[PDB]
Ligand binder design. Sequence first.
Ligand SMILES: NC(=O)c1ccc[n+]([C@@H]2O[C@H](COP(=O)([O-])OP(=O)(O)OC[C@H]3O[C@@H](n4cnc5c(N)ncnc54)[C@H](O)[C@@H]3O)[C@@H](O)[C@H]2O)c1
Ligand SMILES: NC(=O)c1ccc[n+]([C@@H]2O[C@H](COP(=O)([O-])OP(=O)(O)OC[C@H]3O[C@@H](n4cnc5c(N)ncnc54)[C@H](O)[C@@H]3O)[C@@H](O)[C@H]2O)c1
Ligand SMILES: NC(=O)c1ccc[n+]([C@@H]2O[C@H](COP(=O)([O-])OP(=O)(O)OC[C@H]3O[C@@H](n4cnc5c(N)ncnc54)[C@H](O)[C@@H]3O)[C@@H](O)[C@H]2O)c1
Ligand SMILES: NC(=O)c1ccc[n+]([C@@H]2O[C@H](COP(=O)([O-])OP(=O)(O)OC[C@H]3O[C@@H](n4cnc5c(N)ncnc54)[C@H](O)[C@@H]3O)[C@@H](O)[C@H]2O)c1
Ligand SMILES: N#Cc1ccc2ccc(C(=O)c3ccc(F)c(O)c3)nc2c1
Ligand SMILES: N#Cc1ccc2ccc(C(=O)c3ccc(F)c(O)c3)nc2c1
Ligand SMILES: N#Cc1ccc2ccc(C(=O)c3ccc(F)c(O)c3)nc2c1
Ligand SMILES: N#Cc1ccc2ccc(C(=O)c3ccc(F)c(O)c3)nc2c1
Ligand SMILES: OC[C@H]1O[C@@H](O)[C@H](O)[C@@H](O)[C@@H]1O
Ligand SMILES: OC[C@H]1O[C@@H](O)[C@H](O)[C@@H](O)[C@@H]1O
Ligand SMILES: OC[C@H]1O[C@@H](O)[C@H](O)[C@@H](O)[C@@H]1O
Ligand SMILES: OC[C@H]1O[C@@H](O)[C@H](O)[C@@H](O)[C@@H]1O
Ligand code: NA
Ligand code: NA
Ligand code: NA
Ligand code: NA
Lengths: 257, 257, 257, 257
Amino acid sequence: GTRYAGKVVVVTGGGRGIGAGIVRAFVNSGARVVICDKDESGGRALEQELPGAVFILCDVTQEDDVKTLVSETIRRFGRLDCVVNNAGHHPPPQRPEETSAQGFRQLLELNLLGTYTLTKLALPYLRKSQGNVINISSLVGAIGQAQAVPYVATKGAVTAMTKALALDESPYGVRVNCISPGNIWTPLWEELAALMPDPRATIREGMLAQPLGRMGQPAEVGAAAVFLASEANFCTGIELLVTGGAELGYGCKAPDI
Amino acid sequence: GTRYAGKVVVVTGGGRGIGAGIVRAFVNSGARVVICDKDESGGRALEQELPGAVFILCDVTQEDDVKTLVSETIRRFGRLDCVVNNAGHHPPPQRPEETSAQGFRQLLELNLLGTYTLTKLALPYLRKSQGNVINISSLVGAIGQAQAVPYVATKGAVTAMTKALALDESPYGVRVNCISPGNIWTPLWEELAALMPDPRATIREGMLAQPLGRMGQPAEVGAAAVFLASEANFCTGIELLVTGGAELGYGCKAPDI
Amino acid sequence: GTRYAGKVVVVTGGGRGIGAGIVRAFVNSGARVVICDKDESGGRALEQELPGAVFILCDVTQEDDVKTLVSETIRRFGRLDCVVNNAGHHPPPQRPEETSAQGFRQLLELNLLGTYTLTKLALPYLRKSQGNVINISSLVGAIGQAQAVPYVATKGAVTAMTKALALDESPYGVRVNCISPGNIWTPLWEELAALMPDPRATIREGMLAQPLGRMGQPAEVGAAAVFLASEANFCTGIELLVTGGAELGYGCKAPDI
Amino acid sequence: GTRYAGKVVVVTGGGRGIGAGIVRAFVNSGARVVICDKDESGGRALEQELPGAVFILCDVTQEDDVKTLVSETIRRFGRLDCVVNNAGHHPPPQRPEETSAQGFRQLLELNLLGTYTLTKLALPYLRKSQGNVINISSLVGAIGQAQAVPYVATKGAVTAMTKALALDESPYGVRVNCISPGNIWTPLWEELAALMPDPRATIREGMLAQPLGRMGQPAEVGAAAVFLASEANFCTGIELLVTGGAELGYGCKAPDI
Ligand SMILES: NC(=O)c1ccc[n+]([C@@H]2O[C@H](COP(=O)([O-])OP(=O)(O)OC[C@H]3O[C@@H](n4cnc5c(N)ncnc54)[C@H](O)[C@@H]3O)[C@@H](O)[C@H]2O)c1
Ligand SMILES: NC(=O)c1ccc[n+]([C@@H]2O[C@H](COP(=O)([O-])OP(=O)(O)OC[C@H]3O[C@@H](n4cnc5c(N)ncnc54)[C@H](O)[C@@H]3O)[C@@H](O)[C@H]2O)c1
Ligand SMILES: NC(=O)c1ccc[n+]([C@@H]2O[C@H](COP(=O)([O-])OP(=O)(O)OC[C@H]3O[C@@H](n4cnc5c(N)ncnc54)[C@H](O)[C@@H]3O)[C@@H](O)[C@H]2O)c1
Ligand SMILES: NC(=O)c1ccc[n+]([C@@H]2O[C@H](COP(=O)([O-])OP(=O)(O)OC[C@H]3O[C@@H](n4cnc5c(N)ncnc54)[C@H](O)[C@@H]3O)[C@@H](O)[C@H]2O)c1
Ligand SMILES: N#Cc1ccc2ccc(C(=O)c3ccc(F)c(O)c3)nc2c1
Ligand SMILES: N#Cc1ccc2ccc(C(=O)c3ccc(F)c(O)c3)nc2c1
Ligand SMILES: N#Cc1ccc2ccc(C(=O)c3ccc(F)c(O)c3)nc2c1
Ligand SMILES: N#Cc1ccc2ccc(C(=O)c3ccc(F)c(O)c3)nc2c1
Ligand SMILES: OC[C@H]1O[C@@H](O)[C@H](O)[C@@H](O)[C@@H]1O
Ligand SMILES: OC[C@H]1O[C@@H](O)[C@H](O)[C@@H](O)[C@@H]1O
Ligand SMILES: OC[C@H]1O[C@@H](O)[C@H](O)[C@@H](O)[C@@H]1O
Ligand SMILES: OC[C@H]1O[C@@H](O)[C@H](O)[C@@H](O)[C@@H]1O
Ligand code: NA
Ligand code: NA
Ligand code: NA
Ligand code: NA
């Protein structure tokens, strides 16, 4: 309850799923948390539920929303120590020829540029606090995924951008790290599975993609984020995998001709 | 002179630098090459110089330019076997707070979406020929670079997109690979060094970043591309490093406090 | 003080350096710790200093020493939850032609087989407790190091072995992870620097190999180990980098000929 | 037929499987090849079959066999340009508790120390010729494999050792690279499958582990080796994957509890 006491954290997309788990983990560590989300429903309830968390409506694709997010965080709490860029989206499965440049641009706006924009506006305050940035990327940025060319590209960009910024901000004492989750059971996962011909089979396949035989939880991503913020002072530019071992070994991906 | 005989290759940004080296390597392997560039000067001269190479003016950020590139390749040569997405740019060094979202969007248009667009328009023909895609990414997509947040992000995206598309196109027999060059001596490298306070010192530093003690040549990237196209039939989704060992070992990147 | 309460941890090479930092981190988390070392001096003093830590003399290259370590841990504390395979050595810098097969075999005995042996003897008890294995590998297993062929090979083996065992033990609920430290200021680092022509310059170079501009501390490796043991329940087979960013960007490792 | 003309290559374990494919690829490139194997049957026939290849009986675990291999290569051909350390073995599947330290030591002797020993004895001649080293590692050194702790550890060591030696030999102009094959259809693969309850199902699973839906061929590893030797002059310390994409995407490796 004291690992991150006295600290102020902003979590984007904090109203449900992984983001809500991260919010909860930081509140439990003693921090004050600003929940950012484009939708009011989940985050407003989370603000009522958690002493030490407040909700600010903010679409991270809208630069003036993000400017107000940062200025309101400072006005209300007087410092900023950690930014968790969690807001993002995975479209339904799309064959490459079914994608469009414009859809790709829109997904880049959320998954990549929204992270870039908040980080930029927050860095002056993070320098004052020797704070840190945590980006929520994805395992599939590293290893690929089927029927997800735009999504995979955005997460490859987030992971690489994390390393670049880590280099640039290291002289100023600001660490920049990312978490690459694998299959985490969230409302996004449940929504995507419901789109498939056999949602139960899709979910079972999702569980069995991990050697641990289950999907991960938001709380587990949250514990990884609290570690990076509060106890990883010699870590910068790392990609912390929270995947249950999905990247390990051979599996079903499809004699020598 | 016969490793890729009878094959048709498109090389974007083929008018100078790495792209020209790739053009030359494919012509020497027996292929017919379409040189795509937004600038006429280098590519037009290369077309006169090399029997088996022709030049098509095409800005890969303009979808109708790229549509015409593909349709003219098929009209003139009757097949398409390999697309080398080499066109790209590295801006001058920029501190993160000196970057802009709009500049980031523009660099994404060239380095990422231009590759995406040509690949998309070319894939129907590559499926017919069991052809392949070669994307020119960068080592710094994997390991980061200082004062280059947007550039690094675009190349992280290219490398990840390569793996995603490799997965999607594997059922159709189309391989998708990338090359990640390190410091290659090109007109871009020379132009960027000339911007620095001490260009000669910047170049010397660039050479010494490699254990091999020199920068690479376009011809060396070209040989890697010809290998991927012509002789790497069990390789898909790989990142072939052409870096002189820059990613190896400890160096100068800046007792326990 | 309660994150790992009620748990029993064995730390090999726990008498000084990183191992002692790991011991301290686990005691501070509420665990009981068995300090294993081949030398009595540091570990015996640590046992007197820390309530909740005890010292067992044990050379991890001697299978009967390790058998007794495990049986005495169970006899004295009634369970085993985590094994931290930290014992290891870095020889003085050695040109490849100055190495020998026999010296390589001896270093494999310590850095690789000692880890293998304790893990094997401990796994039956870790299965009962749904415990976990933490191996201390090295960044240079991943990226290489100059004048250290045998050492680098042993750490490449530890990192790979971690992933293999993670796969094998995942059905039994036992997680297997590693930490790859970079330059950590320890008595080993101080001893090796003292061998060099200019020890102060060697140390300064060591600090500047990290973007953060300093070396790491044992306490920082220790916090990473406590995270892996106590809060990383969806992590198995990962390599957690504790390197200060040394693997990021271009540096000094040595125009195109 | 001229890419590696006038060059002399040693291939260990060259009598069958991948090694024989590598032998054939180098002969077809114009090189003279010394086939090293501990068994006479395959390599002696290959020597009769291929003008430009000769067979030398040599067990790479026996240092005096390897000394004679190098001295006989120089005596008979007057130079040495490339060493391909292909000899190695994969034991039958073994649960971790079914392995032994002594079995692990023996596998290290072949898969790791045999490579080390030939490389050491060959490096003085490779320096004279600005030659290169190609080690045959494995994809599972990078990503792990089930029921293969010792094997995986040996290949993690080979890949890491490749990078270390690349660093050490770069000042002398000697490049050191590795190839990490995935599932390649060889007599070893056929022998291991025959041990399983349902060999045909094991083989079908092996094919489907690759997005390309087949296993690789020795000839494909061979083409990768010829590229590294003859045309990859700016590549050192790389791991060239010849895996058919097995490392890409999610598969079958085994809702959030
Ligand atoms: N669930 C997984 O398996 C998984 C795996 C890897 C990575 N991820 C990443 O984790 C993050 C969270 O994923 P999730 O599964 O919890 O998703 P989710 O859809 O359950 O929750 C995402 C939250 O972000 C909010 N959000 C979306 N667009 C926003 C915007 N423009 N501005 C502000 N908030 C916005 C949503 O309203 C929602 O509350 C994303 O970056 C996703 O790419 C998820
Ligand atoms: N030079 C290096 O050290 C280096 C290192 C890693 C990666 N790369 C990558 O290699 C590729 C080539 O780099 P280079 O150094 O040869 O650069 P360069 O600037 O010397 O040549 C690039 C060529 O692409 C053309 N081009 C630019 N924008 C274009 C567009 N919109 N449409 C069509 N053609 C366009 C240019 O006119 C030029 O002919 C780029 O993707 C770059 O990111 C270069
Ligand atoms: N210090 C660094 O920069 C660094 C970097 C990366 C990895 N590592 C790894 O971290 C680990 C600890 O390194 P360190 O710097 O603290 O070293 P250290 O030499 O300071 O401490 C090592 C401890 O292990 C003990 N030990 C050695 N051989 C043993 C054996 N046979 N049985 C039992 N105990 C034995 C020693 O007595 C000593 O107490 C090693 O695995 C090392 O390879 C260290
Ligand atoms: N087949 C695969 O799927 C695969 C995958 C990844 C890596 N590999 C690696 O490729 C290499 C070749 O594998 P393969 O499948 O062709 O095996 P193989 O068993 O078919 O052929 C290996 C050859 O090496 C020889 N050899 C074995 N021990 C030797 C020794 N002590 N001295 C000299 N020669 C010796 C054998 O006699 C045989 O001719 C090995 O290093 C293996 O680990 C194979
Ligand atoms: N085809 C398909 C499919 C079906 C259901 C899914 C459910 C969830 C996800 C998803 O959002 C996801 C899954 C894994 C990731 F690493 C990641 O970043 C995102 N992907 C799915 C992909
Ligand atoms: N600061 C700086 C700086 C100075 C000169 C440079 C000259 C060239 C490059 C460059 O374009 C480059 C360098 C290395 C790369 F891997 C890459 O993709 C691009 N980067 C430079 C970066
Ligand atoms: N040459 C050299 C040199 C000089 C001093 C050193 C001091 C410490 C170390 C060392 O033990 C080390 C350094 C970094 C590592 F990642 C690692 O696993 C071990 N390596 C050194 C290497
Ligand atoms: N269980 C099991 C199993 C069954 C049949 C196999 C047949 C071949 C191999 C094998 O030798 C191998 C397979 C893949 C590799 F990357 C590698 O280095 C080696 N592994 C197998 C593993
Ligand atoms: O909808 C799937 C899951 O989403 C998670 O974010 C919630 O914490 C769970 O209660 C829910 O089961
Ligand atoms: O301008 C730097 C270099 O660019 C390369 O692309 C050209 O092939 C070289 O002739 C030139 O030295
Ligand atoms: O000897 C170098 C360092 O070793 C560390 O393990 C100790 O905790 C420090 O007190 C000491 O400065
Ligand atoms: O035994 C499996 C395969 O081994 C390969 O090395 C041979 O070239 C093939 O002819 C054979 O089918
Ligand atoms: Na509240
Ligand atoms: Na022409
Ligand atoms: Na005590
Ligand atoms: Na012959």
